[PDB]
Amino acid sequence: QDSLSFGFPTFPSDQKNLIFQGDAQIKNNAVQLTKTDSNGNPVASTVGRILFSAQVHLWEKSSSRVANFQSQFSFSLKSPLSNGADGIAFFIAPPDTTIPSGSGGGLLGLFAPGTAQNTSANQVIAVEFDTFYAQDSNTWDPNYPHIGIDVNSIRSVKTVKWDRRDGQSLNVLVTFNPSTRNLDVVATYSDGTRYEVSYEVDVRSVLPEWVRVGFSAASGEQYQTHTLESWSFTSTLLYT
Amino acid sequence: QDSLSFGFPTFPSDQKNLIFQGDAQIKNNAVQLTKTDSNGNPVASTVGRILFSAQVHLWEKSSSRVANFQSQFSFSLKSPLSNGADGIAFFIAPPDTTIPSGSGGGLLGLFAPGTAQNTSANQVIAVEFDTFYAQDSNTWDPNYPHIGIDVNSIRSVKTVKWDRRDGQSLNVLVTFNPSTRNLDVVATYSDGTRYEVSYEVDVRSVLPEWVRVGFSAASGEQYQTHTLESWSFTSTLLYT
Ligand SMILES: OC[C@H]1O[C@H](O[C@@H]2[C@H](O)[C@@H](O)O[C@H](CO)[C@H]2O)[C@@H](O)[C@@H](O)[C@@H]1O
Ligand SMILES: [Ca+2]
Ligand SMILES: [Ca+2]
Ligand SMILES: [Mn+2]
Ligand SMILES: [Mn+2]
């Protein structure tokens, strides 16, 4: 289809169109990307992702068209630790994408250690909300929590300072306009605090015509819950 | 998802979210539900169906919600004969639906012979565009071409006299309103000729909570092409 849209105001346990990978599962009408114990507390060494089952037609060679898409979602992070890790990311990748071996912790379940910073070995666009930036282990990160745009590498093409707020939901709107090729990110907390970051990228040179969209999160030695609370997505092919 | 929508203005060969069953295949940017030869002419004894891959949440027992839905599509029928058969149908059924054994010809690839008129043995709602009504083989049909609403039986609960026009595209709008429980069908030819038929039905007592939507067509001894040209669908769970 040239156009596709779906909306999850909440996430009931009875799901049919979500692909669950790793430890991801539904609990209390939300998606818990990372594993939690019986008490609902976060644990270390966990990775989880979800993808919508239907494939999205991002661009089309034959017609020279590229999709205009928007993804709106909200999530919250919670941890008793002073340095909860590692973060959650909205991502777009080839349909057959699976969790790479050793992609835990700072690699957010998106990259393999051997090629995490090799842009020629990956096919992924992701918007990360990264809460762990220890310069000794996450050497590629700026020294502070941040929102980053990742294009084929865990080393973001761009980041902006972000404030992690325990237990508070962050609403995010990610849009891509094929005419300007701008990928825009706008995130806000309920008190009006806003973060904005944009990057110009030709998705046709990074991803295949058909892709899947979803979320990924991980926790290494430090941990926190990564709770996806709602998600709506729409995409339509436009001539450009 | 509480809401889902998709649109196929045309049907390029590169399809990823369609389930093809029987003889259905893409040719010339359209879906040919029934088999055709090299010259492109229709052949006898063929059945074909397509279903969208993502499951639709038609109703939710826990929240007591039922979805409204709208399906818009266009198709054309062509045949060297004047008695083209058998017809095409838009249908909604359980996700694991497959072509029943011996469902060719007048059964439109939707029902099994032994239970075609047994409402207690079926789970399907369909809107048929029936062009063949010979009483020797299609005993359940009115004696004229027609559009009908089928609820668990090949014998339509409601029909309207219809005119088959070789090679002309028929635009159809099918809508279900959970508030009134009315399934409405409006079909029009380009010159404005219009046909309408509606029926009140509680989808909750006929189908499971999750379903798949698609089209089916068949040709027995008499034949014609059943070309699906475009298709858009939208569904949203409502409280009412
Ligand atoms: O495709 C039309 C029709 O074909 C087959 O039935 C035949 C027709 O009723 C007509 O041609 O007369 C034949 C002789 O009695 C009869 O077989 C079946 O496949 C039927 O299901 C289909 O509708
Ligand atoms: Ca990090
Ligand atoms: Ca018939
Ligand atoms: Mn980072
Ligand atoms: Mn009929």
Side-chain angles (χ1 to χ4, degrees), chain B residues 5-6 38 53 60 66 68 80 139 145 148 174 183 192 202 225 234 236:
Chain B
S5 69
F6 57 77
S38 302
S53 65
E60 179 177 292
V66 179
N68 84 319
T139 64
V174 177
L183 175 62
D202 183 357
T225 59
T234 181
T236 304

PDB file of all heavy atoms in Angstrom, chain B residues 5-6 38 53 60 66 68 80 139 145 148 174 183 192 202 225 234 236:
ATOM      1  N   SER B   5      -5.498   1.779   8.986  1.00  0.00           N
ATOM      2  CA  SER B   5      -5.962   2.184   7.663  1.00  0.00           C
ATOM      3  C   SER B   5      -4.856   1.934   6.651  1.00  0.00           C
ATOM      4  O   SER B   5      -3.673   1.960   6.989  1.00  0.00           O
ATOM      5  CB  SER B   5      -6.384   3.659   7.637  1.00  0.00           C
ATOM      6  OG  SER B   5      -5.276   4.517   7.771  1.00  0.00           O
ATOM      7  N   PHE B   6      -5.242   1.643   5.414  1.00  0.00           N
ATOM      8  CA  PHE B   6      -4.264   1.417   4.363  1.00  0.00           C
ATOM      9  C   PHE B   6      -4.906   1.745   3.033  1.00  0.00           C
ATOM     10  O   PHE B   6      -6.133   1.676   2.893  1.00  0.00           O
ATOM     11  CB  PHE B   6      -3.720  -0.030   4.397  1.00  0.00           C
ATOM     12  CG  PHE B   6      -4.772  -1.106   4.294  1.00  0.00           C
ATOM     13  CD1 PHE B   6      -5.357  -1.423   3.069  1.00  0.00           C
ATOM     14  CD2 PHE B   6      -5.164  -1.817   5.428  1.00  0.00           C
ATOM     15  CE1 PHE B   6      -6.319  -2.440   2.970  1.00  0.00           C
ATOM     16  CE2 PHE B   6      -6.127  -2.837   5.342  1.00  0.00           C
ATOM     17  CZ  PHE B   6      -6.702  -3.149   4.112  1.00  0.00           C
ATOM     18  N   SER B  38      -2.171 -16.471 -21.565  1.00  0.00           N
ATOM     19  CA  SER B  38      -1.110 -15.605 -22.069  1.00  0.00           C
ATOM     20  C   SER B  38      -1.671 -14.370 -22.764  1.00  0.00           C
ATOM     21  O   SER B  38      -1.155 -13.264 -22.597  1.00  0.00           O
ATOM     22  CB  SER B  38      -0.224 -16.378 -23.045  1.00  0.00           C
ATOM     23  OG  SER B  38       0.338 -17.518 -22.419  1.00  0.00           O
ATOM     24  N   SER B  53      -2.424  -8.608   5.189  1.00  0.00           N
ATOM     25  CA  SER B  53      -1.733  -9.364   6.239  1.00  0.00           C
ATOM     26  C   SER B  53      -2.025  -8.963   7.683  1.00  0.00           C
ATOM     27  O   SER B  53      -2.140  -9.824   8.554  1.00  0.00           O
ATOM     28  CB  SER B  53      -0.215  -9.335   6.007  1.00  0.00           C
ATOM     29  OG  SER B  53       0.293  -8.020   6.130  1.00  0.00           O
ATOM     30  N   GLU B  60     -13.958  -5.492  20.772  1.00  0.00           N
ATOM     31  CA  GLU B  60     -13.210  -5.822  21.975  1.00  0.00           C
ATOM     32  C   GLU B  60     -14.169  -6.084  23.128  1.00  0.00           C
ATOM     33  O   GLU B  60     -14.862  -5.182  23.595  1.00  0.00           O
ATOM     34  CB  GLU B  60     -12.257  -4.661  22.292  1.00  0.00           C
ATOM     35  CG  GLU B  60     -11.408  -4.825  23.537  1.00  0.00           C
ATOM     36  CD  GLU B  60     -10.441  -3.668  23.728  1.00  0.00           C
ATOM     37  OE1 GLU B  60      -9.496  -3.533  22.924  1.00  0.00           O
ATOM     38  OE2 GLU B  60     -10.630  -2.882  24.677  1.00  0.00           O
ATOM     39  N   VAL B  66     -16.855  -1.708  19.522  1.00  0.00           N
ATOM     40  CA  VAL B  66     -17.013  -2.350  18.228  1.00  0.00           C
ATOM     41  C   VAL B  66     -16.494  -1.342  17.215  1.00  0.00           C
ATOM     42  O   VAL B  66     -16.756  -0.144  17.326  1.00  0.00           O
ATOM     43  CB  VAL B  66     -18.490  -2.680  17.931  1.00  0.00           C
ATOM     44  CG1 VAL B  66     -18.619  -3.330  16.562  1.00  0.00           C
ATOM     45  CG2 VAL B  66     -19.031  -3.604  19.004  1.00  0.00           C
ATOM     46  N   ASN B  68     -15.908   0.670  13.615  1.00  0.00           N
ATOM     47  CA  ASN B  68     -16.667   1.132  12.476  1.00  0.00           C
ATOM     48  C   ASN B  68     -15.643   0.788  11.399  1.00  0.00           C
ATOM     49  O   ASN B  68     -14.469   0.576  11.715  1.00  0.00           O
ATOM     50  CB  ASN B  68     -16.868   2.647  12.540  1.00  0.00           C
ATOM     51  CG  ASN B  68     -15.689   3.423  11.975  1.00  0.00           C
ATOM     52  OD1 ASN B  68     -14.528   3.074  12.196  1.00  0.00           O
ATOM     53  ND2 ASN B  68     -15.987   4.495  11.254  1.00  0.00           N
ATOM     54  N   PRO B  80     -15.367 -12.665 -23.041  1.00  0.00           N
ATOM     55  CA  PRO B  80     -15.701 -12.829 -24.458  1.00  0.00           C
ATOM     56  C   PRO B  80     -17.168 -13.239 -24.575  1.00  0.00           C
ATOM     57  O   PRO B  80     -17.812 -13.018 -25.598  1.00  0.00           O
ATOM     58  CB  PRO B  80     -14.756 -13.951 -24.892  1.00  0.00           C
ATOM     59  CG  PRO B  80     -13.588 -13.802 -23.920  1.00  0.00           C
ATOM     60  CD  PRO B  80     -14.379 -13.677 -22.646  1.00  0.00           C
ATOM     61  N   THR B 139     -29.048 -22.419  -7.134  1.00  0.00           N
ATOM     62  CA  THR B 139     -30.430 -22.451  -6.657  1.00  0.00           C
ATOM     63  C   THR B 139     -30.792 -21.380  -5.639  1.00  0.00           C
ATOM     64  O   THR B 139     -31.941 -20.961  -5.558  1.00  0.00           O
ATOM     65  CB  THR B 139     -30.762 -23.825  -6.038  1.00  0.00           C
ATOM     66  OG1 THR B 139     -29.955 -24.032  -4.871  1.00  0.00           O
ATOM     67  CG2 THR B 139     -30.475 -24.939  -7.034  1.00  0.00           C
ATOM     68  N   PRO B 145     -28.852 -10.751 -12.227  1.00  0.00           N
ATOM     69  CA  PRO B 145     -27.565 -10.326 -11.664  1.00  0.00           C
ATOM     70  C   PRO B 145     -27.869  -9.459 -10.446  1.00  0.00           C
ATOM     71  O   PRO B 145     -28.857  -8.733 -10.436  1.00  0.00           O
ATOM     72  CB  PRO B 145     -26.930  -9.562 -12.827  1.00  0.00           C
ATOM     73  CG  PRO B 145     -28.152  -9.044 -13.588  1.00  0.00           C
ATOM     74  CD  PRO B 145     -28.959 -10.310 -13.625  1.00  0.00           C
ATOM     75  N   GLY B 148     -25.242  -8.551  -3.279  1.00  0.00           N
ATOM     76  CA  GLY B 148     -25.871  -9.096  -2.096  1.00  0.00           C
ATOM     77  C   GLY B 148     -24.995  -9.025  -0.871  1.00  0.00           C
ATOM     78  O   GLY B 148     -23.773  -8.918  -0.965  1.00  0.00           O
ATOM     79  N   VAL B 174     -18.240   0.440   1.054  1.00  0.00           N
ATOM     80  CA  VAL B 174     -18.906  -0.423   2.036  1.00  0.00           C
ATOM     81  C   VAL B 174     -18.604   0.193   3.399  1.00  0.00           C
ATOM     82  O   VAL B 174     -17.445   0.440   3.729  1.00  0.00           O
ATOM     83  CB  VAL B 174     -18.356  -1.873   2.004  1.00  0.00           C
ATOM     84  CG1 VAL B 174     -19.025  -2.716   3.092  1.00  0.00           C
ATOM     85  CG2 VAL B 174     -18.604  -2.497   0.647  1.00  0.00           C
ATOM     86  N   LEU B 183     -24.794  -2.121   7.876  1.00  0.00           N
ATOM     87  CA  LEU B 183     -23.717  -2.383   6.931  1.00  0.00           C
ATOM     88  C   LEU B 183     -24.315  -1.812   5.646  1.00  0.00           C
ATOM     89  O   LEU B 183     -25.296  -2.354   5.122  1.00  0.00           O
ATOM     90  CB  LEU B 183     -23.479  -3.885   6.793  1.00  0.00           C
ATOM     91  CG  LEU B 183     -22.452  -4.331   5.750  1.00  0.00           C
ATOM     92  CD1 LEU B 183     -21.084  -3.789   6.103  1.00  0.00           C
ATOM     93  CD2 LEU B 183     -22.423  -5.851   5.697  1.00  0.00           C
ATOM     94  N   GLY B 192     -22.751   7.672 -13.226  1.00  0.00           N
ATOM     95  CA  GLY B 192     -23.626   8.027 -12.126  1.00  0.00           C
ATOM     96  C   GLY B 192     -24.667   6.987 -11.753  1.00  0.00           C
ATOM     97  O   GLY B 192     -25.395   7.171 -10.775  1.00  0.00           O
ATOM     98  N   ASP B 202     -25.198  -7.492  13.797  1.00  0.00           N
ATOM     99  CA  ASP B 202     -24.346  -7.341  14.969  1.00  0.00           C
ATOM    100  C   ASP B 202     -23.123  -8.201  14.687  1.00  0.00           C
ATOM    101  O   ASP B 202     -23.160  -9.425  14.831  1.00  0.00           O
ATOM    102  CB  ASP B 202     -25.071  -7.832  16.222  1.00  0.00           C
ATOM    103  CG  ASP B 202     -24.254  -7.629  17.485  1.00  0.00           C
ATOM    104  OD1 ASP B 202     -23.101  -7.158  17.391  1.00  0.00           O
ATOM    105  OD2 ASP B 202     -24.771  -7.944  18.576  1.00  0.00           O
ATOM    106  N   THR B 225     -12.880 -12.143 -16.265  1.00  0.00           N
ATOM    107  CA  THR B 225     -11.789 -11.731 -15.398  1.00  0.00           C
ATOM    108  C   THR B 225     -12.424 -10.992 -14.225  1.00  0.00           C
ATOM    109  O   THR B 225     -13.517 -10.431 -14.359  1.00  0.00           O
ATOM    110  CB  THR B 225     -10.837 -10.767 -16.115  1.00  0.00           C
ATOM    111  OG1 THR B 225     -11.566  -9.606 -16.532  1.00  0.00           O
ATOM    112  CG2 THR B 225     -10.218 -11.440 -17.327  1.00  0.00           C
ATOM    113  N   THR B 234     -10.290   1.460   6.259  1.00  0.00           N
ATOM    114  CA  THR B 234     -10.029   2.117   7.524  1.00  0.00           C
ATOM    115  C   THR B 234     -10.974   1.558   8.572  1.00  0.00           C
ATOM    116  O   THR B 234     -12.137   1.289   8.283  1.00  0.00           O
ATOM    117  CB  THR B 234     -10.200   3.649   7.428  1.00  0.00           C
ATOM    118  OG1 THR B 234      -9.912   4.229   8.706  1.00  0.00           O
ATOM    119  CG2 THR B 234     -11.614   4.017   7.036  1.00  0.00           C
ATOM    120  N   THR B 236     -11.819   1.789  13.029  1.00  0.00           N
ATOM    121  CA  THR B 236     -11.535   2.439  14.305  1.00  0.00           C
ATOM    122  C   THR B 236     -12.472   1.880  15.372  1.00  0.00           C
ATOM    123  O   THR B 236     -13.681   1.863  15.173  1.00  0.00           O
ATOM    124  CB  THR B 236     -11.797   3.964  14.246  1.00  0.00           C
ATOM    125  OG1 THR B 236     -11.038   4.553  13.181  1.00  0.00           O
ATOM    126  CG2 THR B 236     -11.399   4.617  15.567  1.00  0.00           C
TER     127      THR B 236
END
